[PDB]
Amino acid sequence: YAHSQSLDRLMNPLIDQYLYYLARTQSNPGGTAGNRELQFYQGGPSTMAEQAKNWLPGPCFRQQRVSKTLDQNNNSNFAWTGATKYHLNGRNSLVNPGVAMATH
Amino acid sequence: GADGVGNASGNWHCDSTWLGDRVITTSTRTWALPTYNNHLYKQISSETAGSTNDNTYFGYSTPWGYFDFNRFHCHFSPRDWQRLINNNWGFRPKKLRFKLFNIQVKEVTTNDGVTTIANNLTSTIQVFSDSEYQLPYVLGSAHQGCLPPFPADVFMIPQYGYLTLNNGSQSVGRSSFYCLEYFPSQMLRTGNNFEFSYSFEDVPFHSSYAHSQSLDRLMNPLIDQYLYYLARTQSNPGGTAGNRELQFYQGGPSTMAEQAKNWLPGPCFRQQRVSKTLDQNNNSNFAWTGATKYHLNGRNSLVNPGVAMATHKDDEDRFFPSSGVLIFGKTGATNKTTLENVLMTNEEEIRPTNPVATEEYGIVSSNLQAANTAAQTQVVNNQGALPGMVWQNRDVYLQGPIWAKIPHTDGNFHPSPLMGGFGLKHPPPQILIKNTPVPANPPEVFTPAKFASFITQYSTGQVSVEIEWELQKENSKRWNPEIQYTSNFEKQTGVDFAVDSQGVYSEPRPIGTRYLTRNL
Amino acid sequence: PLMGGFGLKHPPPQILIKNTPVPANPPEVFTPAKFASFITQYSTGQVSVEIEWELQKENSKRWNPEIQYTSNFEKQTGVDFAVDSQGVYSEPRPIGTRYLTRNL
Numbered sequence: 001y002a003h004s005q006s007l008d009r010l011m012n013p014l015i016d017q018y019l020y021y022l023a024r025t026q027s028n029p030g031g032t033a034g035n036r037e038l039q040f041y042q043g044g045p046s047t048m049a050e051q052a053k054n055w056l057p058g059p060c061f062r063q064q065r066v067s068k069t070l071d072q073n074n075n076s077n078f079a080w081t082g083a084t085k086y087h088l089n090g091r092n093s094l095v096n097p098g099v100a101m102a103t104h
Numbered sequence: 105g106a107d108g109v110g111n112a113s114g115n116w117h118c119d120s121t122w123l124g125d126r127v128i129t130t131s132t133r134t135w136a137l138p139t140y141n142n143h144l145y146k147q148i149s150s151e152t153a154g155s156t157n158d159n160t161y162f163g164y165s166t167p168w169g170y171f172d173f174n175r176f177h178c179h180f181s182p183r184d185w186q187r188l189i190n191n192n193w194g195f196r197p198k199k200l201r202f203k204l205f206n207i208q209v210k211e212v213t214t215n216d217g218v219t220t221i222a223n224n225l226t227s228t229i230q231v232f233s234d235s236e237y238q239l240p241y242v243l244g245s246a247h248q249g250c251l252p253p254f255p256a257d258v259f260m261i262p263q264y265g266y267l268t269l270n271n272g273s274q275s276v277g278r279s280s281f282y283c284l285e286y287f288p289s290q291m292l293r294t295g296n297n298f299e300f301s302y303s304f305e306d307v308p309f310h311s312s313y314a315h316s317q318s319l320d321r322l323m324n325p326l327i328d329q330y331l332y333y334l335a336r337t338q339s340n341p342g343g344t345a346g347n348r349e350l351q352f353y354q355g356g357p358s359t360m361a362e363q364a365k366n367w368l369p370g371p372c373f374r375q376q377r378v379s380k381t382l383d384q385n386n387n388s389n390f391a392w393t394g395a396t397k398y399h400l401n402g403r404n405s406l407v408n409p410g411v412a413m414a415t416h417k418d419d420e421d422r423f424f425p426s427s428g429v430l431i432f433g434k435t436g437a438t439n440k441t442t443l444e445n446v447l448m449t450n451e452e453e454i455r456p457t458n459p460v461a462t463e464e465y466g467i468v469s470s471n472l473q474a475a476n477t478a479a480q481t482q483v484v485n486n487q488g489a490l491p492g493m494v495w496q497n498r499d500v501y502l503q504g505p506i507w508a509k510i511p512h513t514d515g516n517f518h519p520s521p522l523m524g525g526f527g528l529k530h531p532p533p534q535i536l537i538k539n540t541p542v543p544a545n546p547p548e549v550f551t552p553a554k555f556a557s558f559i560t561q562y563s564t565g566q567v568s569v570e571i572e573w574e575l576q577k578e579n580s581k582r583w584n585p586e587i588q589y590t591s592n593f594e595k596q597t598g599v600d601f602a603v604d605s606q607g608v609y610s611e612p613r614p615i616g617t618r619y620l621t622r623n624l
Numbered sequence: 625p626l627m628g629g630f631g632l633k634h635p636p637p638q639i640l641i642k643n644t645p646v647p648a649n650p651p652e653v654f655t656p657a658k659f660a661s662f663i664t665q666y667s668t669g670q671v672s673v674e675i676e677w678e679l680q681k682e683n684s685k686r687w688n689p690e691i692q693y694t695s696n697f698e699k700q701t702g703v704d705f706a707v708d709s710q711g712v713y714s715e716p717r718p719i720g721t722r723y724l725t726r727n728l
């Protein structure tokens with residue numbers, strides 16, 4: 001199965017949380033100068049990214065990005081040199097395919 | 105449902121029963137359910153209000169409402185909460201019993217400013233619990249609309265809507281549409297009532313104890329280890345020149361930090377440090393820019409509250425992690441407030457086993473030394489799990505969420521809700537409720553078109569929920585007195601956790617579960 | 625009780641009564657706030673109470689007649705312990721329990 005929801009969006013879009021987050025470390029600028037203030041909002045439909053969440057995405061061990069259209073790739077050989085590989089007993093072993101991660 | 109109109113379908117039960125190792129808490133409230141969306145399902149998306157790439161969403165909004173009792177203060181009076189955390193090392197839920205009764209439906213008419221409300225006897229409501237977890241699960245997201253803290257309050261049932269996959273503001277073809285009239289649902293008139301029972305799956309006791317020892321200090325102070333460590337890479341300088349030597353000492357009372365240890369502190373994912381005294385903070389906006397956030401599918405999502413970590417260091421009370429705490433409002437606070445109006449929780453009780461949320465995990469060597477080359481090290485801001493780590497989950501608060509649903513996935517690591525409470529693979533089902541449509545008089549000659557025209561109505565009634573909690577007794581042999589949660593004592597203008605002159609119930613402070621101590 | 629009567633460590637319990645709130649029509653879009661808006665209503669009905677009293681009989685050998693509590697006898701504008709022309713019930717005097725005598 002392929003999930004029909006995402007971790008960040010598991011919330012309820014219509015309702016506004018009772019947990020505050022730290023929205024701004026300055027006063028709302030009036031076009032003059034930033035003034036120190038602490039301001040807290042509620043996680044809600046407007047701002048989902050700031051909203052409190054119970055879960056975190058899976059682990060990742062990163063790897064280089066290659067494009068199928070040749071002209072967008074750099075001109076060099078980064079295959080082995082810019083590879084993502086693990087170092088075991090003096091041996092550099094390419095990480096293939098690696099930890100499961102979304103391709104693009 | 106059994107009897108007719110003039111017979112009440114159920115008694116009011118709000119009570120607490122403390123017996124042995126269990127505590128059975130019953131709470132009853134009066135609820136009111138409006139008519140949402142004029143009985144329509146509307147696809148909602150961020151396309152309407154531009155927002156930003158991180159906040160885009162796509163989903164649906166439903167006429168259905170739902171009952172939420174996901175906070176502790178629903179089931180606990182502050183007194184009962186005081187008995188729990190003072191006398192016990194842990195508690196977990198066992199069974200659940202849910203009842204709707206004394207259902208009333210009202211029809212309302214508006215003529216030239218006059219609002220007339222009258223009973224509608226024959227109209228019904230629809231209630232079904234989702235036992236099979238087939239719907240999107242919006243509980244555990246810490247929304248509002250939960251039963252009020254205070255039994256005499258009346259509350260309105262929140263609307264049910266859900267989100268799905270999207271590309272920008274559009275809908276990817278994997279997006280799902282769930283029609284909620286496609287499930288079996290019991291229909292209830294004023295004589296009918298609704299009930300079901302539930303049984304929690306076995307979960308670990310929450311830890312209501314704060315350790316009395318720290319990982320680094322678990323040793324014996326009087327005795328000196330038999331394991332050497334590498335003390336110095338030079339000869340003891342006589343004030344002339346450093347001379348290469350290798351020297352080993354024994355771990356002992358003098359030097360505890362160098363001493364060999366079996367265990368490592370819990371994992372950390374670091375976050376920025378903010379001070380409550382304004383003049384000590386930088387002048388800039390680092391809130392979102394200097395935030396600690398995770399990058400998922402092109403979306404930058406703030407990490408809140410994050411992995412459980414001690415909020416501040418030993419002597420520093422005023423600092424708190426930027427995103428690393430649960431923050432509550434004081435009574436009568438809007439959705440945009442300053443520092444004084446929030447109630448900010450701190451975890452100081454996990455300082456022994458956990459890193460401080462605002463500081464590094466450790467420091468680690470980045471290079472191979474040589475005769476000419478000097479040793480270099482780098483700081484560890486984030487650390488995954490390493491064999492030999494121990495940690496403590498975030499505490500639960502009287503206002504905090506009780507449970508959350510562990511998503512259905514191939515794998516997870518030590519699932520517990522980062523906000524707090526009990527991770528459940530099969531949580532208490534979602535109870536949904538709706539007012540059945542009543543059509544206004546049809547045109548008298550047939551037309552195929554949708555009605556869109558109904559009698560405006562709402563329904564009210566009572567709901568009761570009874571959870572059976574299991575306890576873990578305090579065995580400790582500690583000689584000196586424990587810390588406890590204590591009421592104010594000194595005179596004050598009004599009682600804490602009680603109504604003021606205007607009838608507004610108010611909770612002055614958050615209350616955590618960790619007071620009693622035990623050895624690490 | 626210094627006022628009088630029977631001191632009880634477990635007296636007749638307090639019977640409390642309230643009219644359950646009936647909400648007025650809610651706004652149709654969710655708000656967390658307290659209602660404060662209800663349908664004004666009251667309730668009426670009957671209540672009955674039945675107490676079983678125990679007595680202690682008068683054994684006295686006293687020869688001459690006792691004092692008793694006696695009604696007015698002589699004509700008056702209206703009866704004692706009864707409604708007047710306006711329907712107002714009235715109690716003319718207090719009445720104590722101590723008339724019959726016994727030796728000290």
Ligand SMILES: Nc1ncnc2c1ncn2[C@H]1C[C@H](O)[C@@H](COP(=O)(O)O)O1
Nearest residue numbers: 307308309518519520521525526527528
């Ligand atoms: N919150 C929560 N829910 C479910 N499972 C959890 C949770 N925290 C940890 N675990 C898992 C991970 C541990 O290996 C194990 C301890 O279960 P024990 O019963 O203590 O032997 O349970």
